[PDB]
Amino acid sequence: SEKYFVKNGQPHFLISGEVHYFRINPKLWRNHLQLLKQTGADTVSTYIPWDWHEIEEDDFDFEGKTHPARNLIRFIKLCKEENLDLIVKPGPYILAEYENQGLPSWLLKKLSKNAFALDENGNVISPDLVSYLSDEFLEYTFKWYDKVMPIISKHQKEHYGPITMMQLCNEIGVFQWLSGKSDYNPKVINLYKEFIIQRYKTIEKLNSVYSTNYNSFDDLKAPSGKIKLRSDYCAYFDFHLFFREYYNKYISILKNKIRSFGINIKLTHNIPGWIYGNASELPMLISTYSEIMKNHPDIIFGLDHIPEFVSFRNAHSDLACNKILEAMQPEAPVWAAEFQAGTREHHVKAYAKDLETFYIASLAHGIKGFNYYMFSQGINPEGKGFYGKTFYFQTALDAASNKLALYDSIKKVNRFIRKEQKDLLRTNVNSEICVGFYKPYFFTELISSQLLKEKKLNVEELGLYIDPRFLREEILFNGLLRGLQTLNYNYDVVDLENCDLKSLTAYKQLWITSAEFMDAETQNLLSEFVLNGGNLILYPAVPTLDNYLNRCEILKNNFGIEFITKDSSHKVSAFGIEDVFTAFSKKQIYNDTNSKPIAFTQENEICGIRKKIGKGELTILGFAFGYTSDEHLELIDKLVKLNKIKRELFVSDKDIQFVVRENNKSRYIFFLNYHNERKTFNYRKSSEEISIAPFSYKVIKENK
Amino acid sequence: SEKYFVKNGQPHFLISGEVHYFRINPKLWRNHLQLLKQTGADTVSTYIPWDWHEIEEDDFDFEGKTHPARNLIRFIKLCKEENLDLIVKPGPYILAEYENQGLPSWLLKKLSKNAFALDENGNVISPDLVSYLSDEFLEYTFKWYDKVMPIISKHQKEHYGPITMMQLCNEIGVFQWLSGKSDYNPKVINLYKEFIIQRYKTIEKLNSVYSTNYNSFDDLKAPSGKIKLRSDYCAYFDFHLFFREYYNKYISILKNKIRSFGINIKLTHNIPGWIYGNASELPMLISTYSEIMKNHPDIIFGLDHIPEFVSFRNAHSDLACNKILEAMQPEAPVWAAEFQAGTREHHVKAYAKDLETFYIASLAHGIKGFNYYMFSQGINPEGKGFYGKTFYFQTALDAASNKLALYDSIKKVNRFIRKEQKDLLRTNVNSEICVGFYKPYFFTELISSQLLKEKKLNVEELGLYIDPRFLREEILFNGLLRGLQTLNYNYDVVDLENCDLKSLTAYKQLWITSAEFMDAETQNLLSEFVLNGGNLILYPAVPTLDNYLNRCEILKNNFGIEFITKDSSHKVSAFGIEDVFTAFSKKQIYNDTNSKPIAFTQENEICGIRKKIGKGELTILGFAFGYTSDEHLELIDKLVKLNKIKRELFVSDKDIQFVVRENNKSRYIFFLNYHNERKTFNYRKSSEKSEEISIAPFSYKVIKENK
Ligand SMILES: OC[C@H]1O[C@H](Oc2ccccc2)[C@H](O)[C@@H](O)[C@@H]1O
Ligand SMILES: OC[C@H]1O[C@H](Oc2ccccc2)[C@H](O)[C@@H](O)[C@@H]1O
């Protein structure tokens, strides 16, 4: 049932280290590789920078003719001689704090204006930033692939070379995320028009959905500026859908070109979204790959994990990300393509004792492989660094292959992983809670994000009051998921899109965090789930609109629900918990015919009910809570206990986190102390008395 | 020369604990006070909530007649019996996570719409947010003062009562900051119009400064919306000046009213600005008090320190804040009105082992007094909690008066303080570096802040490239001040406004972080500083404009500087350091005349020079760096060594922070490990058998030397 990497027909924990040959003295290449191998790592990973190897137009150096660190061929040869597999990442974009993000200077000087990503006025967004589908960009990308891909092909495992995986490009769409700017290149906009024509067929159909007054598709302009009208929201929503198809068109073109060279190894991509040691925005980035993930079963996405520190402040980020990736990519192992080792930023410390706990927590949280990023520090050649001379700090090895504090932490964790991998990789957690992932709430990177300074989405101007980004960050990510992890309740996440009803019935509860809008297919799915015998917890709103904010009351009508939205105090009572702080004055006040009232406003109006529908159960809360008080943890605990869900262990200290991973023969108990306090506690199933240091861990094995 | 509290003509370390009588079973009040006293605390501090005591309009209970915990009079008498002095804070605002920020529900229901803070449309900003100078608000505030102030007066120290200090209101302007919404109440806009007429006298004079074409003062409207023209920037700048006068009028009215009750105790106010464990915005909030601090020498401002954790991620916040308060309030001790104990938010943990280090770091960083907030947890009575039933977590005492883990940390710190306070309060750090505090760069809370959502200031639209908020946050707060602390070079901060040259002349170096604008007074001051023998480090710009973005080239002309602004790679070389990443493509390129070139662009154009001017030295760098790379620390170190400034100690681990504090009698060495690593290091004094020390993660050592 578990998904994991395989070597010699047995479960294999992929342990990779990132070592940038182009940033290391080649006299020390062998020493770096030997020290990486001696930690128990099996794989080494690097970019192959286009700028570094196509030194002038149609002048390629892979042999160190012009600089010894351009000897890619020797580096590949050394990986094989030192018994490491190799991951290669030839771009065209590498990012990696490399000047021009890896594109050649000669290329960026030579490209015409229409090869660049353009703002709505037709101005170049950045001299760094090409249009992914530019004819000229792809032609030059293809000429780079024509040189590097024959080398990669010849050095595949198949041909007793070390190369086992290749990444296509790097964090596709990350520049639109960080800037909050869409590419309005006329070639992109023509592709958007085609998408829209393909989707709606006639202007009459688009007008009926958007409430627009176009006489033809010629009238239609790409959305831009703030959303003022529901028609602007509709247009921006489809513009988000378009970019997900656009990114699939791009990676498909690279993939087909790669396959033409007989490259049959595993293809990868990498997911950004951490910043300042928080990952609450990474689900938005995962959502931009929805069309890639549906159309490429053979491309493995891995996570870029950048925790920076390890404490209760960010403990929930990596679990929530790993669970959402599992939801979106159920047929591949959850792995970290970039797994923090040292720090990209000198002033943002990465402590060995923090990262060691992160590595063990990551195992608890279901990770099946990782690539330490950066295992080895680099020195930027010839000022090719965007920032200073040095690439990364507090790594396992400095750029001269000096061992640093993190080295012995990685060796220790790797030795544990190698000892346990055969059993540990085959373990899962017993989740009786399912949490719905509704991707359209996440489709906002051009209008609502932590990184976008401008707020292009203001739901109150649309006659709404539940903002999807507030819902998905504060009520879901930092609220429910943080709360369940803090309470040591296992959950799984399920992608509600095309979701199999049969997959939902294993769970005792399904939790849906709902705004005022939800498509017909999802309202029908939740209707059928409850009628067939499921237990649904739904808050803060019964939805009444579809994704285009047109009337859709399927779930409301099927459940016999009636409500009025009314203003009250932020505080409610729920299940006899007084003073539960809620996000909104406006709440849903429910008619309680055939219902049990279970939550009350300060004036005793009914803002939550329970109800039997068909064979199933409904709990509807007409208010939004996250986790910002002890009453929130009390309320989640009461909700979980409605359907008699139990934690695996009794642990005497509530502030110890545990994860029980089991298969038929083996149990692992991961204890995690995310607190600056030496804790002593005892545990038993639902002497045995253990002490854990601050920001530390303990793993116990039990045979069944 | 140190400023410290004095008790009976001796240095006194003010150690207070916050204990909310209104949130504690009154049968347990005495036990809370006894346990606070047993930590060596000398004072207890509490809000007196208007909502709690004026239970209905004109129905007052201070005696526990309608609820036992309304017995303020008994709580005061218990403070006296348990030998604790008392700080009282009757508002009218208390915030304190109390429903309606302390204002009575009956008041907010009764007030007419023109008592509230309004947006530009005339919509109520928040049902909890009054207009400070609303006639209706002040009439009810005065009726509240009429009942609580006679009690406070009767129980003052000079009448043998325990009350020694009183806070006026609570964090004035904290609501205008957090919403980024200014009050457009007609009372406020009318006061602004009077302020503008008084400032400019004639519409012609205002039009000459702003470059506007108004026919009369009646055509001038309060600024709103984004700044698009230099005229919009001028209007918003005067609007900021007006709000500083507005807050001074509010506090002046409360002060005048209080003094009429015969209340002669020390008056206080409290500075907000920490959020998410970072204080980089606090200097903006303290700048909103510029006019109060000039007009009220007798109101002592204290800091509200909320670090949440204690690591390299926030190590520089408390020192930079303590130094900036000293700069604005040099005649009073640096103290924390609210000094984090436990956590206001269940999900935001406060570890005893973090806060213990914070307490010791605060001593190293020159704190002279504090009020542990919260010493005692509370339980909100009668649904009065804004956010939940429980007030604070992980405190020294739970609501029931049980000792929690933090209790023994506070007792340990208090014990050291009581043993050492006689010498420690008198100790100075030898600062040879002075950093200039240029208040106008901070005057942006209506247009540019971490908390404002809609950014109104875009300097590029004004033909500028150096944003004053980016400068003061990243180049100064997270850059130079962070860098000096990390490198263990002592610095002082000086307010450049009405700054006496004689106060600058004691330093080996003055560091000025400059935007393209700076007033004529400050350009003249810095000119005279260098001519008379001062050593000035100035970056990233020679300014060429005044506070209204009109021509002012005084400093440029006095220093014989010629420059052109040119685009280049972010990276420069400086003092032989290659690949120094700088914030901007645009750099100042200086003529080499009568100067040594010491920094070069990628085209080897000159973007920094050193020169001798009169008896002084000038170092100008035409590029912006904070601390986002190792090269930045190398550059700060190089600049400091230009005048042969030395650290107090050789320490074998550069990641150990230290402060040496000394007087004639005593030397204290404070070592601070802001890192999750057990560190073993050695040290010795820079002049004149190295000592070895092992320090735990996130921990401290203090060494006392006699002589
Ligand atoms: O911290 C923001 C992002 O920082 C990087 O991405 C960029 C891309 C362009 C410029 C700067 C950072 C990382 O690759 C990405 O994983 C991360 O989420
Ligand atoms: O963390 C934001 C602020 O949080 C509080 O301020 C408010 C004011 C109003 C509403 C909520 C918090 C603290 O008193 C203040 O010191 C702090 O800077």
Ligand SMILES: [Ca+2]
């Ligand atoms: Ca019904």
